[PDB]
Amino acid sequence: RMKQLEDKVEELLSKAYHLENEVARLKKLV
Amino acid sequence: RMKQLEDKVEELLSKFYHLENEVARLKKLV
Amino acid sequence: RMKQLEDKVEELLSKAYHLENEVARLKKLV
Ligand SMILES: [Mg+2]
Ligand code: NA
Ligand code: NA
Ligand code: NA
Ligand code: NA
Ligand code: NA
Ligand code: NA
């Protein structure tokens, strides 16, 4: 079951990295 | 051990879904 | 393999609090 855990955390890392970008983007638009 | 992590990632999935909605609302107002 | 998953999940949860703060900050500014 460590395979499902690893694929979920890969998805969450990409989520986090994309949210990080949108936070940095949104910071410059205010 | 595997149960503890599962409940933590399922928490992470709900968290990330929630921040994504908030960002989506920040972008519309921005 | 297992300890790295647990460590990465800790690292995600901590960054989600960090992002929660950043998002709430922007939430004011728009
Ligand atoms: Mg999976
Ligand atoms: Na921008
Ligand atoms: Na932008
Ligand atoms: Na276990
Ligand atoms: Na069970
Ligand atoms: Na999901
Ligand atoms: Na390790």
mmCIF file of N, CA and C and ligand atoms in Angstrom:
data_model
loop_
_atom_site.group_PDB
_atom_site.id
_atom_site.type_symbol
_atom_site.label_atom_id
_atom_site.label_comp_id
_atom_site.label_asym_id
_atom_site.label_seq_id
_atom_site.Cartn_x
_atom_site.Cartn_y
_atom_site.Cartn_z
ATOM 1 N N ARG A 1 0.826 -1.200 0.000
ATOM 2 C CA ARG A 1 0.000 0.000 0.000
ATOM 3 C C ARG A 1 0.865 1.257 0.000
ATOM 4 N N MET A 2 2.181 1.085 0.077
ATOM 5 C CA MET A 2 3.064 2.236 -0.050
ATOM 6 C C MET A 2 3.072 2.803 -1.467
ATOM 7 N N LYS A 3 2.616 2.026 -2.465
ATOM 8 C CA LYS A 3 2.489 2.559 -3.824
ATOM 9 C C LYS A 3 1.390 3.609 -3.900
ATOM 10 N N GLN A 4 0.215 3.320 -3.335
ATOM 11 C CA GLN A 4 -0.856 4.315 -3.325
ATOM 12 C C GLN A 4 -0.475 5.550 -2.500
ATOM 13 N N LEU A 5 0.241 5.353 -1.392
ATOM 14 C CA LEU A 5 0.676 6.497 -0.599
ATOM 15 C C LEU A 5 1.641 7.377 -1.378
ATOM 16 N N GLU A 6 2.509 6.766 -2.188
ATOM 17 C CA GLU A 6 3.509 7.522 -2.925
ATOM 18 C C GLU A 6 2.888 8.277 -4.080
ATOM 19 N N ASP A 7 1.868 7.703 -4.708
ATOM 20 C CA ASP A 7 1.244 8.396 -5.823
ATOM 21 C C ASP A 7 0.379 9.539 -5.317
ATOM 22 N N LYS A 8 -0.293 9.343 -4.186
ATOM 23 C CA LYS A 8 -1.031 10.451 -3.599
ATOM 24 C C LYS A 8 -0.097 11.598 -3.217
ATOM 25 N N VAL A 9 1.081 11.289 -2.667
ATOM 26 C CA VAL A 9 1.929 12.393 -2.233
ATOM 27 C C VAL A 9 2.622 13.051 -3.421
ATOM 28 N N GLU A 10 2.804 12.329 -4.529
ATOM 29 C CA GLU A 10 3.240 13.000 -5.751
ATOM 30 C C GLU A 10 2.179 14.001 -6.230
ATOM 31 N N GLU A 11 0.904 13.592 -6.249
ATOM 32 C CA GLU A 11 -0.175 14.511 -6.625
ATOM 33 C C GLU A 11 -0.228 15.723 -5.693
ATOM 34 N N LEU A 12 -0.009 15.511 -4.392
ATOM 35 C CA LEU A 12 -0.102 16.613 -3.437
ATOM 36 C C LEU A 12 1.077 17.563 -3.563
ATOM 37 N N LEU A 13 2.258 17.040 -3.926
ATOM 38 C CA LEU A 13 3.400 17.917 -4.151
ATOM 39 C C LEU A 13 3.153 18.843 -5.338
ATOM 40 N N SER A 14 2.678 18.293 -6.457
ATOM 41 C CA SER A 14 2.360 19.136 -7.607
ATOM 42 C C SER A 14 1.291 20.163 -7.258
ATOM 43 N N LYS A 15 0.248 19.738 -6.529
ATOM 44 C CA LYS A 15 -0.746 20.668 -5.992
ATOM 45 C C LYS A 15 -0.082 21.784 -5.198
ATOM 46 N N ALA A 16 0.687 21.417 -4.175
ATOM 47 C CA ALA A 16 1.402 22.398 -3.366
ATOM 48 C C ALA A 16 2.276 23.323 -4.221
ATOM 49 N N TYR A 17 3.071 22.757 -5.134
ATOM 50 C CA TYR A 17 3.943 23.607 -5.939
ATOM 51 C C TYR A 17 3.140 24.553 -6.821
ATOM 52 N N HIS A 18 1.980 24.109 -7.307
ATOM 53 C CA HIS A 18 1.160 24.980 -8.135
ATOM 54 C C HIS A 18 0.474 26.045 -7.298
ATOM 55 N N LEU A 19 -0.009 25.678 -6.107
ATOM 56 C CA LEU A 19 -0.562 26.678 -5.198
ATOM 57 C C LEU A 19 0.494 27.702 -4.789
ATOM 58 N N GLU A 20 1.720 27.252 -4.500
ATOM 59 C CA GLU A 20 2.818 28.180 -4.215
ATOM 60 C C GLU A 20 2.982 29.230 -5.313
ATOM 61 N N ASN A 21 2.949 28.788 -6.579
ATOM 62 C CA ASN A 21 3.072 29.698 -7.717
ATOM 63 C C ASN A 21 1.934 30.711 -7.734
ATOM 64 N N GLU A 22 0.711 30.259 -7.436
ATOM 65 C CA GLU A 22 -0.460 31.132 -7.506
ATOM 66 C C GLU A 22 -0.476 32.132 -6.361
ATOM 67 N N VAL A 23 0.060 31.720 -5.207
ATOM 68 C CA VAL A 23 0.289 32.642 -4.099
ATOM 69 C C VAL A 23 1.315 33.698 -4.494
ATOM 70 N N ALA A 24 2.424 33.271 -5.111
ATOM 71 C CA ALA A 24 3.403 34.258 -5.553
ATOM 72 C C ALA A 24 2.821 35.149 -6.644
ATOM 73 N N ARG A 25 2.107 34.561 -7.610
ATOM 74 C CA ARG A 25 1.429 35.377 -8.606
ATOM 75 C C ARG A 25 0.456 36.342 -7.934
ATOM 76 N N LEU A 26 -0.444 35.821 -7.096
ATOM 77 C CA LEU A 26 -1.457 36.685 -6.486
ATOM 78 C C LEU A 26 -0.837 37.799 -5.637
ATOM 79 N N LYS A 27 0.337 37.554 -5.043
ATOM 80 C CA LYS A 27 1.022 38.586 -4.261
ATOM 81 C C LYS A 27 1.344 39.821 -5.104
ATOM 82 N N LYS A 28 1.701 39.620 -6.375
ATOM 83 C CA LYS A 28 2.097 40.726 -7.238
ATOM 84 C C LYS A 28 0.908 41.462 -7.845
ATOM 85 N N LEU A 29 -0.286 40.867 -7.809
ATOM 86 C CA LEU A 29 -1.469 41.467 -8.408
ATOM 87 C C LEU A 29 -2.251 42.359 -7.448
ATOM 88 N N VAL A 30 -1.928 42.341 -6.155
ATOM 89 C CA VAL A 30 -2.563 43.253 -5.208
ATOM 90 C C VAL A 30 -1.788 44.564 -5.122
ATOM 91 N N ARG B 1 0.939 1.955 11.624
ATOM 92 C CA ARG B 1 1.774 2.929 10.925
ATOM 93 C C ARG B 1 1.143 3.370 9.595
ATOM 94 N N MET B 2 0.688 2.381 8.818
ATOM 95 C CA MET B 2 0.065 2.674 7.536
ATOM 96 C C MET B 2 -1.288 3.330 7.723
ATOM 97 N N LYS B 3 -1.986 2.975 8.799
ATOM 98 C CA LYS B 3 -3.267 3.613 9.090
ATOM 99 C C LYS B 3 -3.076 5.077 9.457
ATOM 100 N N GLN B 4 -2.076 5.363 10.297
ATOM 101 C CA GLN B 4 -1.785 6.726 10.722
ATOM 102 C C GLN B 4 -1.501 7.624 9.533
ATOM 103 N N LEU B 5 -0.685 7.151 8.589
ATOM 104 C CA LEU B 5 -0.364 7.972 7.431
ATOM 105 C C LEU B 5 -1.578 8.169 6.528
ATOM 106 N N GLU B 6 -2.372 7.112 6.322
ATOM 107 C CA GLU B 6 -3.554 7.223 5.473
ATOM 108 C C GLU B 6 -4.473 8.329 5.964
ATOM 109 N N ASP B 7 -4.735 8.358 7.274
ATOM 110 C CA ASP B 7 -5.603 9.394 7.816
ATOM 111 C C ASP B 7 -4.978 10.772 7.667
ATOM 112 N N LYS B 8 -3.644 10.837 7.605
ATOM 113 C CA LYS B 8 -2.973 12.119 7.443
ATOM 114 C C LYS B 8 -3.017 12.593 5.998
ATOM 115 N N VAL B 9 -2.867 11.677 5.033
ATOM 116 C CA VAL B 9 -2.952 12.112 3.647
ATOM 117 C C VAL B 9 -4.386 12.451 3.292
ATOM 118 N N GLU B 10 -5.356 11.670 3.792
ATOM 119 C CA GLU B 10 -6.743 12.027 3.521
ATOM 120 C C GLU B 10 -7.076 13.397 4.110
ATOM 121 N N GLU B 11 -6.400 13.774 5.200
ATOM 122 C CA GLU B 11 -6.469 15.132 5.720
ATOM 123 C C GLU B 11 -5.806 16.116 4.761
ATOM 124 N N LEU B 12 -4.653 15.728 4.206
ATOM 125 C CA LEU B 12 -3.944 16.582 3.264
ATOM 126 C C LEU B 12 -4.748 16.784 1.993
ATOM 127 N N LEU B 13 -5.446 15.739 1.526
ATOM 128 C CA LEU B 13 -6.254 15.876 0.318
ATOM 129 C C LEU B 13 -7.396 16.866 0.533
ATOM 130 N N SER B 14 -8.043 16.808 1.694
ATOM 131 C CA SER B 14 -9.141 17.730 1.980
ATOM 132 C C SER B 14 -8.629 19.160 2.152
ATOM 133 N N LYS B 15 -7.458 19.315 2.763
ATOM 134 C CA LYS B 15 -6.851 20.625 2.988
ATOM 135 C C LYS B 15 -6.550 21.275 1.648
ATOM 136 N N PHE B 16 -6.008 20.485 0.733
ATOM 137 C CA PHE B 16 -5.478 21.021 -0.508
ATOM 138 C C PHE B 16 -6.633 21.426 -1.411
ATOM 139 N N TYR B 17 -7.665 20.584 -1.445
ATOM 140 C CA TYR B 17 -8.949 20.926 -2.048
ATOM 141 C C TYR B 17 -9.501 22.252 -1.490
ATOM 142 N N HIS B 18 -9.350 22.478 -0.181
ATOM 143 C CA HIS B 18 -9.906 23.685 0.423
ATOM 144 C C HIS B 18 -9.100 24.929 0.060
ATOM 145 N N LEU B 19 -7.766 24.840 0.082
ATOM 146 C CA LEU B 19 -6.958 25.987 -0.320
ATOM 147 C C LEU B 19 -7.181 26.324 -1.789
ATOM 148 N N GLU B 20 -7.384 25.294 -2.628
ATOM 149 C CA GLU B 20 -7.563 25.505 -4.061
ATOM 150 C C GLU B 20 -8.829 26.304 -4.332
ATOM 151 N N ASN B 21 -9.899 26.014 -3.594
ATOM 152 C CA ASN B 21 -11.126 26.799 -3.711
ATOM 153 C C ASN B 21 -10.880 28.249 -3.308
ATOM 154 N N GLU B 22 -10.208 28.451 -2.170
ATOM 155 C CA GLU B 22 -9.899 29.800 -1.711
ATOM 156 C C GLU B 22 -9.103 30.571 -2.772
ATOM 157 N N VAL B 23 -8.070 29.946 -3.344
ATOM 158 C CA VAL B 23 -7.304 30.610 -4.409
ATOM 159 C C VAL B 23 -8.219 30.965 -5.578
ATOM 160 N N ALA B 24 -9.056 30.010 -5.994
ATOM 161 C CA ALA B 24 -9.979 30.246 -7.095
ATOM 162 C C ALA B 24 -10.843 31.470 -6.843
ATOM 163 N N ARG B 25 -11.201 31.713 -5.574
ATOM 164 C CA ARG B 25 -11.985 32.893 -5.228
ATOM 165 C C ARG B 25 -11.114 34.143 -5.150
ATOM 166 N N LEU B 26 -9.845 33.985 -4.755
ATOM 167 C CA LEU B 26 -8.929 35.124 -4.770
ATOM 168 C C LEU B 26 -8.677 35.605 -6.190
ATOM 169 N N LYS B 27 -8.557 34.675 -7.137
ATOM 170 C CA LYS B 27 -8.244 35.075 -8.500
ATOM 171 C C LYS B 27 -9.409 35.821 -9.140
ATOM 172 N N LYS B 28 -10.646 35.404 -8.851
ATOM 173 C CA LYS B 28 -11.800 36.067 -9.449
ATOM 174 C C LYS B 28 -11.913 37.512 -8.971
ATOM 175 N N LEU B 29 -11.618 37.756 -7.692
ATOM 176 C CA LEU B 29 -11.666 39.106 -7.138
ATOM 177 C C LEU B 29 -10.474 39.956 -7.562
ATOM 178 N N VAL B 30 -9.314 39.327 -7.751
ATOM 179 C CA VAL B 30 -8.076 40.023 -8.074
ATOM 180 C C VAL B 30 -8.177 40.863 -9.343
ATOM 181 N N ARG C 1 11.877 3.336 2.505
ATOM 182 C CA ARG C 1 10.658 3.689 1.800
ATOM 183 C C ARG C 1 9.577 4.218 2.775
ATOM 184 N N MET C 2 9.372 3.533 3.901
ATOM 185 C CA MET C 2 8.284 3.915 4.809
ATOM 186 C C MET C 2 8.598 5.186 5.591
ATOM 187 N N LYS C 3 9.825 5.322 6.106
ATOM 188 C CA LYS C 3 10.166 6.514 6.878
ATOM 189 C C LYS C 3 10.132 7.769 6.010
ATOM 190 N N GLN C 4 10.555 7.647 4.749
ATOM 191 C CA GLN C 4 10.523 8.776 3.817
ATOM 192 C C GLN C 4 9.095 9.237 3.546
ATOM 193 N N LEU C 5 8.151 8.290 3.427
ATOM 194 C CA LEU C 5 6.738 8.640 3.271
ATOM 195 C C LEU C 5 6.232 9.406 4.484
ATOM 196 N N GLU C 6 6.535 8.906 5.686
ATOM 197 C CA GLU C 6 6.102 9.586 6.898
ATOM 198 C C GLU C 6 6.724 10.972 6.993
ATOM 199 N N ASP C 7 8.013 11.084 6.675
ATOM 200 C CA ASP C 7 8.687 12.377 6.724
ATOM 201 C C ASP C 7 8.105 13.353 5.704
ATOM 202 N N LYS C 8 7.823 12.871 4.483
ATOM 203 C CA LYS C 8 7.224 13.718 3.444
ATOM 204 C C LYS C 8 5.818 14.165 3.816
ATOM 205 N N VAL C 9 5.049 13.298 4.461
ATOM 206 C CA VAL C 9 3.711 13.700 4.868
ATOM 207 C C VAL C 9 3.782 14.797 5.925
ATOM 208 N N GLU C 10 4.692 14.664 6.904
ATOM 209 C CA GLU C 10 4.954 15.747 7.859
ATOM 210 C C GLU C 10 5.293 17.061 7.154
ATOM 211 N N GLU C 11 6.199 16.990 6.180
ATOM 212 C CA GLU C 11 6.622 18.152 5.396
ATOM 213 C C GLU C 11 5.463 18.794 4.612
ATOM 214 N N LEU C 12 4.548 17.980 4.086
ATOM 215 C CA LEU C 12 3.372 18.528 3.415
ATOM 216 C C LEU C 12 2.463 19.264 4.394
ATOM 217 N N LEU C 13 2.076 18.597 5.488
ATOM 218 C CA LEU C 13 1.158 19.189 6.460
ATOM 219 C C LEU C 13 1.683 20.530 6.977
ATOM 220 N N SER C 14 2.997 20.625 7.187
ATOM 221 C CA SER C 14 3.598 21.875 7.636
ATOM 222 C C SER C 14 3.519 22.961 6.568
ATOM 223 N N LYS C 15 3.729 22.602 5.303
ATOM 224 C CA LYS C 15 3.618 23.589 4.239
ATOM 225 C C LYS C 15 2.170 24.023 4.019
ATOM 226 N N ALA C 16 1.201 23.168 4.342
ATOM 227 C CA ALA C 16 -0.204 23.536 4.184
ATOM 228 C C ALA C 16 -0.633 24.571 5.216
ATOM 229 N N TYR C 17 -0.122 24.467 6.445
ATOM 230 C CA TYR C 17 -0.335 25.555 7.399
ATOM 231 C C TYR C 17 0.313 26.849 6.897
ATOM 232 N N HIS C 18 1.566 26.764 6.443
ATOM 233 C CA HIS C 18 2.238 27.909 5.827
ATOM 234 C C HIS C 18 1.420 28.539 4.704
ATOM 235 N N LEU C 19 0.836 27.715 3.841
ATOM 236 C CA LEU C 19 0.041 28.233 2.733
ATOM 237 C C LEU C 19 -1.281 28.801 3.222
ATOM 238 N N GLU C 20 -1.860 28.166 4.237
ATOM 239 C CA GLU C 20 -3.073 28.674 4.844
ATOM 240 C C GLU C 20 -2.862 30.095 5.326
ATOM 241 N N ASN C 21 -1.707 30.355 5.948
ATOM 242 C CA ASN C 21 -1.391 31.710 6.394
ATOM 243 C C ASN C 21 -1.268 32.662 5.206
ATOM 244 N N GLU C 22 -0.464 32.283 4.208
ATOM 245 C CA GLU C 22 -0.270 33.149 3.049
ATOM 246 C C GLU C 22 -1.595 33.477 2.377
ATOM 247 N N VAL C 23 -2.458 32.472 2.202
ATOM 248 C CA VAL C 23 -3.740 32.687 1.534
ATOM 249 C C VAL C 23 -4.614 33.658 2.333
ATOM 250 N N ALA C 24 -4.725 33.444 3.645
ATOM 251 C CA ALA C 24 -5.517 34.348 4.476
ATOM 252 C C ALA C 24 -5.001 35.786 4.390
ATOM 253 N N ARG C 25 -3.684 35.955 4.275
ATOM 254 C CA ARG C 25 -3.093 37.276 4.076
ATOM 255 C C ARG C 25 -3.626 37.946 2.808
ATOM 256 N N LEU C 26 -3.521 37.257 1.669
ATOM 257 C CA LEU C 26 -4.029 37.801 0.419
ATOM 258 C C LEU C 26 -5.529 38.058 0.504
ATOM 259 N N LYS C 27 -6.259 37.203 1.239
ATOM 260 C CA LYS C 27 -7.715 37.314 1.359
ATOM 261 C C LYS C 27 -8.133 38.700 1.836
ATOM 262 N N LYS C 28 -7.357 39.293 2.751
ATOM 263 C CA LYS C 28 -7.588 40.674 3.164
ATOM 264 C C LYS C 28 -7.398 41.635 1.999
ATOM 265 N N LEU C 29 -6.251 41.540 1.318
ATOM 266 C CA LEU C 29 -5.842 42.523 0.325
ATOM 267 C C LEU C 29 -6.712 42.511 -0.934
ATOM 268 N N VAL C 30 -7.680 41.606 -1.039
ATOM 269 C CA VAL C 30 -8.726 41.767 -2.049
ATOM 270 C C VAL C 30 -10.104 41.552 -1.440
HETATM 271 MG MG MG D 1 -2.679 6.404 -5.179
HETATM 272 NA NA NA D 2 0.746 38.058 -11.374
HETATM 273 NA NA NA D 3 -0.257 36.273 -12.930
HETATM 274 NA NA NA D 4 0.918 -0.424 9.539
HETATM 275 NA NA NA D 5 -9.978 -1.842 9.113
HETATM 276 NA NA NA D 6 -8.116 14.180 -4.447
HETATM 277 NA NA NA D 7 15.003 8.480 5.870
#
